[PDB]
Write a protein that binds this DNA or RNA. Structure first.
Lengths: 534, 465, 465
RNA sequence: GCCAGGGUGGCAGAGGGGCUUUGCGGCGGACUUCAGAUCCGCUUUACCCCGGUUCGAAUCCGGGCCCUGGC
């Protein structure tokens, strides 16, 4: 709550220590679901793949290369231009762009159409033989809200969709038609086009880079390869060039990610678009790998590849100068920097159910169902505990005073007792607390047997009696409204969180199940709260 | 050069001043092409599209949304599952994937399609978490989408970037959408927002939730377009319909706001034509600064010996003050030994009544607006000299080097007399200057010109013995 | 080199294969010191302190807190206004600013002091906005602070960075503090947090709000220190007392959490000693990778003519297969004309019964753990060759260049016979190799050694006519 | 790419032409109970995809995929 500067000034200027202690009045009295960890700030997290890509950008930029956006969808003629004869082996691992043709509402299905009863469902409206013809000339997607809402009455698509379903079965006879258009299998396919336009109009050396998507089929499997990927590629254009220039770049690039040693072996593929004996494979050593489970125990892994475009293909695009090309595979680099073994799980985690919630996050989701709504209620419970704590080993029966005050303009007195005998006021589980450890929600008592669950887990700070207390306080508070005069709430044994007034939104519950987690919150609480409201 | 601490250290205690003044001895002696701005560092430059993408990422993260990679390649059955019946229409603007059958030619289509917008993949993703993770769920993603919009280019491209997000909570409303749009767009300079219900009422959005967001950006008021009032449609959003959500077992409402990058980028970096922004390379937009073109203008033949420099150097020093005396006349410029024998440098004009040097000996080469001019530092040309980048290379300056390095050719040739003269200047060549063929083709392509002309009229004779 | 499209373009239609194979003609022919890794790019590297600072900024921004520059130089009256009576103590750990009076020597102090922690400036800042801007106010700042802690260095430095923030709302509690500490620390890898009330109960914090936050970081479990259990005190926080707030007219409570950067940084980049982290330069921590040292090992004398290369090149080709034949014996390596006249290259060993080449002609120079070794590629040295960076320069390889470039000296000297022999190798020198004096002083400083030795025993005679 | 054993429900793993395990766990309810156990009811009666044999297949045969003792 807010205070007054003047006041606190003129009280501090004289009796400091008194002002100081008087500060506590400005703090707020948080209820149960207003305390840590029940409350917390949130922040968004980056996806590893994208994160890596951003680093790559900086890394390239940091070594003189300038960003660019190469052509993604291209005519396979380009591939054929870049691989000469072997161009076939490639285009088979590539995807072609097919598209749905328009439902010819004439000739084929016009003769055998105007021989029967065209339309029946009262729609009339002058023959849209023309408006439905513009569909063969040029239409779109949101054009369905054009030949209905503004044609044969009926707003937007209240009847636009079905009038197409129950009157025209032609739409269910469409099949995509292939084309000469494709989706690049690697940044290189697009480099030739881009370089063609500037390889001689800009000052040398020319250093360009681009980190974009590419597509490729591979046994149509995910556990063997991926349909779409990312390539952090670059091209170096200069008069004189040698594999050295390719090694240098590689080093200077990978060096910003940790790798400390590189080795370059020749690639047996000897691809056509690369000058013979230049297509190098680059192996780099990174610590994070050394002494691992993966096939990269020794620390080395093939991280990128590079070569010098064959003067053959350069000509196919009128490029006079030699060009160097290095290509890093993003996903892998990502996997390394962020520790992931399986590509698929790394990039598409949600789908592969690799979701998780740390202990602290579960703890935060464990709330208190029944909570006092009045400034009085809280004290009632706070005390109900206050007494239940002190008098814990008092042979039953017996009784003790908890709270004596006014609630809603009606004097009230609450008590904590026990009906049975030959025992103690409260069960041997009243002092147990809810702690979250290794994904499970436990209802344990502080003991040298449970240390591991308090020095590695995250205690909710709520104990059976705490949760219960708040429950009762509500009951008595409810009666102070039901105008009753004697409510005696009781709690015997605990099987779950309900028998403690604690709950967790459904999703978190399901999370725990989906992860094979367990909620072991049992025990003999045994406690009753007799409150006389007048 | 590397000096000795002590020397200067002790040499300092004696007479400091003279010691300090001595320092100039460690400074390097630079040849013509080793001087600024014919020398300089370089540095990569990023693309406005990508830059904007990143800006978008931080923007989204800056407001709680966590990143996710959504499925890009999917079976059209998904689109069908999402657009109920109106799906047939949608599949027209989408592409399909076709492969080549293994000949033991003609591509074979498949049920596979590339997502048109992000929303197609969202449901796929949300299905695995909407019921397990704690609410509210806030996810975003900025990736590629493909669309066959009329199948052209003049209006739009086949591939674009979507800056999408989705909010998953028990209670949602068109309001949460507006809220996000603001927080997002504000971080980019937008100041005022207006929302209007989208007419197309796409079926995947709870009827009447689909909205179109309009934002006000001061950078647009007074723009060379209708966006002059400052407003522009920047993003659209809605709440997914229980129908589609149900298809994937998603129990709670979902707010989805998605904005088109290419547009923001153009706005942010001031581009009028999308294509000319993202694919500048192709649409011939390459550009070099005057400073860059400057750096590219270099001397062709420079004195190799340390003597040659101090030779041509003087060659100039003379013609600077004696470019007046009427000819015939003569002035000795330099006298010294090079490689092995004494030599004298002469500068004159054998012609009758006139001047030693042409009226253009002191013209400086400077670049401006893409052109390489050759002009005299006159109050007339001022602007050019105060808004362009002057090479610092004057006609004499450039010629002298050719001269000095020329006697040098005779020196190691055994000769004893060299005639190096120069009349007219019809290009850089005639002045011992050049630019790489690629920059030439550049200026050419940029329809820029090189007006390097003028009567130099300057002769130089040297005799070795 | 720059080729012609057409040529290759047409030359391709004929026989592709032979055209492709032709390509190798455009590749450059590199001399020794132009080869990898004696050539390579470089790139700036950032400091862990600063890096961490930035990481902190985004962290704070990532959770709503806006940046602010707080007053650094202030009058001690402020400290007094804040610490009520306990202020006298505080002013001891703080510095004061003293100037030099203008002599129409002895510095004169003033009431001016440098802030010890961020909190000193916060009140100053908050005073102007706590009542005007809308609540909740969230501000943060990561800047320098100065403290005279015992006035030493072994324990702490005089200047450190504070990653501070302040939260201003109507209702606050020790809870909001814990909340922020988590959100902040989580983004850095911390996973579990524990809070304990601070004993010093500083007066500027509402009595009993001042807390000390402990965080768990897996990167610490198993650390070479007591932080082995994984926990560490990372930040402290509290709620300002109405007393101090009142001194500046601030009506509402304020939560202040502040963490020490230097510590986080050490944790993040794995440093044990603060000073050795932030001031590595001074505490001699300079370091170079084996790869870097490699790049620095270069040939001293390389054949200048294109012929010299293909000459020494052969010189090696021979001794590769004929380093066996017992001497005296002889093998012709090269025969050709250079600069003007034919020449023949000979390789032998005038000595009695022995071998043409020493047993160490084929030893490769490689770097490893900071040392420059010279060793034969034997299963024994393997590791060195598979964990260090091999120069690719072998004894012969390095010698031959000296030879070839040596006949070259005689060629333009008019001679007709040159004796270039080599017995022992007691360093890089004897093998035509060198490293810049600064890298030498480096290895020296890093107490690293250079074991480049071995019996080369190789002679080469050449005769020109 | 190649010899072969095999590809069952939320988890494990028996059988084998159509009727059919079981245990764990879970879902709901019952308890004079002061401690983490007790009882009763419970699911989609589960066994990849395309063909073949058959009255009938998850259990028989061919092809496409997936784990493994292996080349």
């Amino acid at each position: 709550m807010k205070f007054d500067p003047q006041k606190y000034r003129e009280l501090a200027e004289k009796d400091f220590e008194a002002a100081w202690k008087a500060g506590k009045e400005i703090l707020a009295e948080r209820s149960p679901n207003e305390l840590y960890p029940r409350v917390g700030f949130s922040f968004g997290k980056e996806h590893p793949l994208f994160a890596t890509i951003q680093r790559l950008r900086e890394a390239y930029l940091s070594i003189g290369f300038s960003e660019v956006v190469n052509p993604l969808i291209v005519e396979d003629v380009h591939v054929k231009k870049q691989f000469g004869r072997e161009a076939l082996a490639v285009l088979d691992r590539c995807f072609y762009l097919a598209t749905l043709p328009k439902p010819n509402v004439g000739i084929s299905a016009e003769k055998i159409r105007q021989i029967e009863a065209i339309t029946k469902r009262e729609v009339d409206s002058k023959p849209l033989q023309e408006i439905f013809h513009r569909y063969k000339k040029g239409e779109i997607d949101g054009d369905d809200l054009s030949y209905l809402i503004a044609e044969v009455l009926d707003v937007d698509d209240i009847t636009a969709v079905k009038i197409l379903d129950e009157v025209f079965p032609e739409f269910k006879e469409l099949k995509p038609i292939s084309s000469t258009l494709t989706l690049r299998s690697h940044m290189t396919t697009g480099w030739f086009i881009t370089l063609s336009h500037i390889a001689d109009k800009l000052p040398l050396p020319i250093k360009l880079f681009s980190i974009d998507r590419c597509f490729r089929r591979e046994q149509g499997e995910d556990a063997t390869r991926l349909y779409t990927y990312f390539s952090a590629s670059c091209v170096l254009v200069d008069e004189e060039l040698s594999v050295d220039d390719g090694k240098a770049v590689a080093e200077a690039l990978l060096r910003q990610f940790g790798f400390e040693n590189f080795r370059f072996r020749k690639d047996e593929k000897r691809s056509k678009y690369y000058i013979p004996d230049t297509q190098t494979e680059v192996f780099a050593f990174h610590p994070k790998l050394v002494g691992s489970s993966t096939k990269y125990s020794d620390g080395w892994i093939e991280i990128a590849t590079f070569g010098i475009y064959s003067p053959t293909a350069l000509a196919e695009y009128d490029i006079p100068y030699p060009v160097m090309n290095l290509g890093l595979g993003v996903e892998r680099l990502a996997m390394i920097l962020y520790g992931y073994d399986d590509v698929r799980k790394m990039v598409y985690p949600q789908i592969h159910g690799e979701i998780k919630l740390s202990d602290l996050d579960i703890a935060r989701e464990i709330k208190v169902k029944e909570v006092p709504q009045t400034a009085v209620g809280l004290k009632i419970a706070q005390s109900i505990v206050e007494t239940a704590e002190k008098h814990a080993s008092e042979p039953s029966p017996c009784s003790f005073l908890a709270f004596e005050g006014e609630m809603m303009g009606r004097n009230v007195r609450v008590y904590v007792v026990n009906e049975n005998e030959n025992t103690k006021l409260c069960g041997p589980a009243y002092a147990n607390e809810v702690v979250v450890y290794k994904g499970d929600i436990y209802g344990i008592p502080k003991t040298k047997k449970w240390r591991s669950f308090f020095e590695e887990g995250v205690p909710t700070g709520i104990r059976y009696i705490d949760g219960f207390a708040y429950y009762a306080a509500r009951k008595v508070e409810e009666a102070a409204m039901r105008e009753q005069e004697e409510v005696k709430v009781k709690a015997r044994i605990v099987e779950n969180l309900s028998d403690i007034n604690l709950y967790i939104h459904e999703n978190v519950r399901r999370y725990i199940l989906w992860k094979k987690g367990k909620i072991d919150v049992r025990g003999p609480l045994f406690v009753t709260v007799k409150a006389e409201i007048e």
